[PDB]
Design a protein around this ligand. Structure first.
Ligand code: ADP
Lengths: 214, 323, 109, 250, 323, 323
């Protein structure tokens, strides 16, 4: 509600001033954290746009290498799809840190369990080898893209949470403490006024009693 | 206004007795007004009647005492009031309890003192309000925010209290046997909603548990459609206790059914949530909301009870078909 | 223990990715790739994509732009980050920056 | 030095008349003997306590926060007996010292002192706990007439620019420390590391002095330039190139 | 109570005197109690002795002064106390000090006053507390948080102070030469912990540097096992200053050496971290923690010093192995 | 200070009076300084003149008033100030105004009060500042922030205000017809720039529309080249109102014509952009920035008006060619 409901007092005023300063400091630190997260988020966004543009060419080159492969090797797609066995390229999870937020990323890692060797032993040969290299390059691009997008989503969520924290503070908590401090100041003024009235009344009565004695 | 006695309508002014001393009428007369009112109430109590003395504002009586004290140049207590304001208020309120009236014919009168207070600036720390809370056994604190939202009666269900619940459970268990658990559950719902609202104000409803969402929504239903009561309508001007208990019973039964469904389906794949419940029961929720619109006079007590039972049956059937 | 890469695209793209070395058959012999032929329909693509997302070791998922457009509702529903979903071009349809599920979070672009 | 001592247990009316004795002597020495006098009045809070006692003895009702209503006039009467005058070569600089009760800058004594005086030198409990001497905080402190105090022929050409750049770099260093508290040391940039280094060396060489280390203002400015040479010429944006080209080198 | 004097146990009453005054005794006697005590202390100071005087509550003395001032009808200062409260407090306290006593036979006595202040609800702006802080040279402020956590002594080392450190430099630099830098480093460490705890609880513990971790954990060590002393145990009833200085020396030596290791290995392949240090030498941390258990009564001064030197040697050996 | 009247550099003290008093002067003198100044101003007004009274800090006068109240032992009103602070301030400011001076020779003098106030720490909520703002009709809101930014005059042009616009509408329509729409457009431009300052943070400058860019880059033009003004230079120490309205008219004409071009080329494939406009008319923007440097003295009113008309002709030609 409007007030914290701490009874007016000088001790209460000191407590509320300390709490207001602490809330402001926490708001500033969370704002700095949000600024760092947003800077990294926009950097990753620009990197994502650039990587998408570069994929626009790498994927095209790989697809054309495949088209050339089909020129010599023939219809090797069925053989490629049928002989799968075990993946030669796997991924390993990695951790990245931005402010206090951990950003998941991926590692491009090889197994070596090749299964398409000799695929163009007689006719494909060079074209299929080049195609393999081009699609390995494309996978190298897309693993970086995936790491960027994972970090991007995590940063988006963290930025939203931290901005929500900062807004909650500066729109709910700080106004509450400011209202409490204003009320405490008003009530202490009222106490001073009442004490002044009592002392003035006592002084008037003392003067009247002195006159009575005189 | 009229009340039926032995099948004949008789005006309530035939039993009401006003003691009017408006704000601009002499200030010193307010104390005399309060004392005359309480003396009349005691007189009619001594006959065997259960008088009810509505003190329109004891804050004005306290202010009159403060003015007279200032003229007398007395030494003030808190905020200028005299040092005997609390004693005066206690002595005036102590004239209320149900009594075994004097005299030879055994009787049983009463004088229920319902005394409004008017804290300056709405601050309940006011000396008058504090001294009154130190005496009165029921505290119906009203909230300016609720009043501004037009949430009348503006009683603040959190701070407000009554120290007669344990003394009235004897009567409840015999006349409205199914009401005390409903009251307890309603207060639990309201407190839980208060905690969840304190949490949500800073964090939002994204992380709320589904049962917490149901608590919030049933509490909103209870607030907007059970607690608040437009006193200037043909239906809500008077809410008999059969209505007061039936509405609460239906709302608490819906709460129990929703909570049971969600809790028992949390593990299963067909997770039932508040959104599913609301979409499936938009009609039943509206019927619960409009339960307050039943007219005690145009529609009989039997009709109102039958309609509430039918709404309960609709809730049960809808929940069964949902699960 | 490490995660895999999954593909949902035209036969040519799937063949290229397999040559890149992305496919494997697990203990239960489930492939981690799909060729989107004309005989395959939107419901089939949605089902296999949901299986891919549910699988805990999938890691990266790649989808052609047109397939992503076809099954766009599932892409938007998928909100968690770890199943890194990417939209890739195809000879059939070009890739456009607009209407990308990941880019939906960006207004400064 | 002319030393007037009013011990806590000496009469409070003597406490009242002590500052007037001191300032009468200062006026005699400055406006008649024509020598620049520095008046250091210690515990104006204790003086205000004596004033409160005298008011109560007079049977005057307490004013704001229990202090006399005319305390502003009394403090003005004390302070304003200072400054240069026309036709005389003497002056009276004043440095009243206050014990802010409860560290409340809104307390009547510090409030009226700020209203009457022309600056403030803050002694920070945080620096004191960190064991820096003098624990003078330079961010909240101020001296309205520093521009009149400094300059060519008074201190030196570069005093104002050096002071402004030192203040700016110190504030930026505190900000960078706060940011490092959240982002971590690695995430900081080279400029941030430079600012942290300057903050450390500024609190260890400029502020940290030692009780018996008398630095001429030229030594102070040389230390300031040693600290400013942490940064390259470009990040010293508050020092005009005319001054940087002359004092930055070496 | 008994103390060991010249190899014998003698009652404390043989050198203590008590001036008792309960709260219900006359307020005039309550006002004169402090003066009687200080006069007895001054007499025994003039004797050539060091008299430690303990005033149970100067706050109750101030209350007595306030009540008598009211009975006299004087104008009060802030919060109702007489405007001469500070003057009276000064007249009482400043009677302390080390003095070349009067009289021809040369002697040097002293009176050391320890006055207790108990403001209303731990108020720091209390008039009596402010008047006291304006006079006394030592102030062992109260940490309500530490008191609630049961961290005894509950001294709040951030606003508590002692102005006698400068005068004690001569004594330390001749008897405990190494203690002053230890005290300086301990205070710096505690202030750094105070500054880091806010950031840790506002934002998080992940961004902290290794040096920050050293500071935090050494601060925890110092606070829990050097600043935390249970006065009811046989071993911690009275901690000799040799024990205090040796403990602080071990703790600060560990701090400096751990920070040296961390910083030196920073920007190097074989990086060292607080986690590495703790995992390596949890035994050293446990020994540093148990250092507070040494009992001077049975573990003589030589034994305690040798044990602390052995702990320092083990620390150095373990860090040499780490490096 | 000196002023040029009739071609001769006279001293403003030939027409100025200084009611100067420090803080150690009699409190009565400090409190009656304002009244002495306003009475002297009223005297010279009645003489038939236009007087400008300037209270340096009415806060100090209010402090003197509070001190007088305390000395008289009057009841402390809001925050200690007397029970009549608002009445005194209102009655003092009521003495400002334009009058038909009393007497036979038909005269009309005026008294313009420019009394300054000192808000505690930049807070406009203290009684003195609140009453002053309520009473006065203009607030020129100087800003230390802009002073640091080197934007002189430091008038914040966002918290400042003036309630005499509706009063001066007649004068402007008679003499400077276009100035009212020009000023309204300038104010709305500045408000839009302030609103877009937040959007720039959220999405950056690249996400701004062309209309947003034109608004931003004319708001900067007005801030740096119209509002900003150096009092030391010989050319714009004093800016005649004809020059001011000419500069504002040229700037707003640029803004309106650029906005028109952008809006009317939004429909074409060769859409215009602020970058295109800047590249094409860097000369026109330079001339708009250099409109300041016209000397009112050497470059007479006719010459400055002709040059600004030629500038507007050049802008119209360039925009017509581009469109
Ligand atoms: N039970 C109620 N139903 C509808 N409106 C109400 C009810 N109680 C109060 N109000 C509204 O609150 C307003 C104030 O009523 P009243 O109690 O007379 O004021 P006060 O609280 O100052 O005595 C009325 O104008 C009325 O419209």
């Amino acid at each position: 509600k409007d007030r914290i409901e701490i009874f007016p007092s000088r001790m209460a005023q000191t407590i509320m001033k300390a709490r207001l300063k602490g809330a402001q400091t926490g708001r500033n630190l969370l704002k700095k954290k949000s600024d760092a997260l947003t800077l990294r988020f926009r950097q990753i966004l620009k990197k994502i746009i650039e990587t998408k543009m570069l994929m626009g060419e790498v994927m095209r080159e790989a697809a054309f290498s495949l088209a050339e492969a089909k020129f010599t090797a023939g219809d090797f797609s069925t053989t490629v799809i049928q002989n799968v066995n075990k993946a030669q390229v796997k991924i390993r999870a990695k951790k990245d840190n931005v402010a206090g937020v951990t950003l998941p990323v991926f590692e491009h890692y090889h197994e070596g369990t090749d299964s398409y060797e000799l695929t163009g032993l007689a006719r494909g040969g060079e074209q299929l080898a080049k195609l393999k290299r081009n699609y390995a390059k494309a996978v190298e691009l897309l693993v970086e893209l995936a790491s960027l997008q994972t970090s991007f989503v995590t940063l988006d969520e963290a930025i939203k949470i931290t901005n929500r924290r900062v807004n909650a503070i500066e729109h709910v908590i700080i106004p509450r403490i400011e209202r409490t401090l204003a009320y405490i100041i008003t009530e202490l003024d009222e106490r001073e006024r009442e004490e002044f009235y009592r002392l003035k009344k006592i002084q008037e009565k003392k003067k009247i009693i002195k006159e009575k004695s005189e | 206004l009229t009340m039926e006695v032995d099948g004949k309508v008789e005006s309530i002014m035939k039993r009401t007795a006003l003691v009017a001393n408006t704000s601009n009428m002499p200030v010193a007369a307010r104390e005399a007004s309060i004392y005359t009112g309480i003396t009349l109430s005691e007189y009619f109590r001594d006959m065997g009647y259960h008088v009810s003395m509505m003190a329109d504002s004891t804050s004005r009586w306290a202010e009159a005492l403060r003015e007279i004290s200032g003229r007398l140049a007395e030494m003030p207590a808190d905020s200028g009031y005299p040092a005997y304001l609390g004693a005066r208020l206690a002595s005036f309120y102590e004239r209320a309890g149900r009594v075994k009236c004097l005299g030879n014919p055994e009787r049983e009168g009463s004088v229920s003192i319902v005394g409004a207070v008017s804290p300056p600036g709405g601050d309940f720390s006011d000396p008058v309000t504090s001294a009154t809370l130190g005496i009165v056994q029921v505290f119906w604190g009203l909230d300016k925010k609720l009043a501004q939202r037009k949430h009348f009666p503006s009683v603040n269900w959190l701070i407000s209290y009554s120290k007669y619940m344990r003394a009235l459970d004897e009567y409840y268990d015999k006349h409205f046997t199914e009401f005390v658990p409903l009251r307890t559950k309603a207060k639990e719902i309201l407190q839980e909603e208060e905690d969840l609202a304190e949490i949500v104000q800073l964090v939002g409803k994204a992380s709320l548990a589904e049962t917490d969402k149901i608590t919030l929504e049933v509490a909103k239903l209870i607030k907007d459609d059970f607690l608040q009561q437009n006193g200037y309508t043909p239906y809500d001007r008077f809410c008999p206790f059969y209505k007061t208990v039936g509405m609460l019973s239906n709302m608490i039964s819906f709460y129990d059914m929703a909570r049971r469904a969600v809790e028992t389906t949390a593990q299963s794949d067909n997770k039932i949530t508040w959104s599913i419940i609301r979409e499936h029961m938009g009609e039943i929720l509206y019927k619960l909301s409009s339960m307050k619109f039943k007219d005690p006079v145009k529609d009989g007590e039997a009709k109102i009870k039958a309609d509430y039972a039918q709404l309960l049956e609709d809730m049960q059937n809808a929940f069964r078909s949902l699960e | 223990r490490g995660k895999l890469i999954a593909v949902i695209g035209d036969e040519d793209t799937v063949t290229g990715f397999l040559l890149g070395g992305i496919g494997e058959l697990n203990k239960n012999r489930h492939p981690n790739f799909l060729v989107v032929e004309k005989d395959t329909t939107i419901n089939e693509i949605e089902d296999t994509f949901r299986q891919f997302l549910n699988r805990d070791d999938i890691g990266i998922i790649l989808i052609n732009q047109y397939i992503a457009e076809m099954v766009r509702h599932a892409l938007d529903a998928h909100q968690r980050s770890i199943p890194a979903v990417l939209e890739i071009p195809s000879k059939e349809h070009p890739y456009d920056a607009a209407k990308d599920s990941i880019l939906r979070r960006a207004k400064g672009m | 030095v002319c030393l007037f001592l009013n011990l806590a247990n000496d009469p409070t009316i003597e406490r009242i008349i002590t500052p007037r004795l001191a300032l009468t002597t200062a006026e005699f020495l400055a406006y008649q003997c024509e020598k620049h006098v520095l008046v250091i009045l210690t515990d104006m809070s204790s003086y205000a306590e004596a004033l409160r006692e005298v008011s109560a003895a007079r049977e005057e009702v307490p004013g704001r926060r229990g202090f006399p209503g005319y305390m502003y006039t009394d403090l003005a009467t004390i302070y304003e007996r200072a400054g240069r005058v026309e036709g005389r070569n003497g002056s009276i600089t004043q440095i009243p010292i206050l014990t802010m009760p409860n560290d409340d800058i809104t307390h009547p004594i510090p409030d009226l002192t700020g209203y009457i005086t022309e600056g403030q030198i803050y002694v920070d409990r945080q620096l004191h706990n960190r064991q820096i001497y003098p624990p003078i905080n330079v961010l909240p402190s101020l001296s309205r007439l520093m521009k009149s105090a400094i300059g060519e022929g008074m201190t030196r050409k570069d005093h104002a620019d050096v002071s402004n750049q030192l203040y700016a770099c110190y504030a930026i260093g505190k900000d960078v420390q706060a940011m490092k508290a959240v982002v971590g040391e690695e995430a900081l940039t080279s400029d941030d590391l430079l600012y942290l280094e300057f903050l450390q060396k500024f609190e260890k060489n400029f502020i940290t002095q030692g009780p018996y280390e008398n630095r001429t203002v030229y030594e102070t400015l040389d230390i300031g330039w040693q600290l400013l040479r942490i940064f390259p010429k470009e990040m010293l944006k508050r020092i005009p190139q005319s001054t940087l080209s002359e004092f930055y080198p070496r």
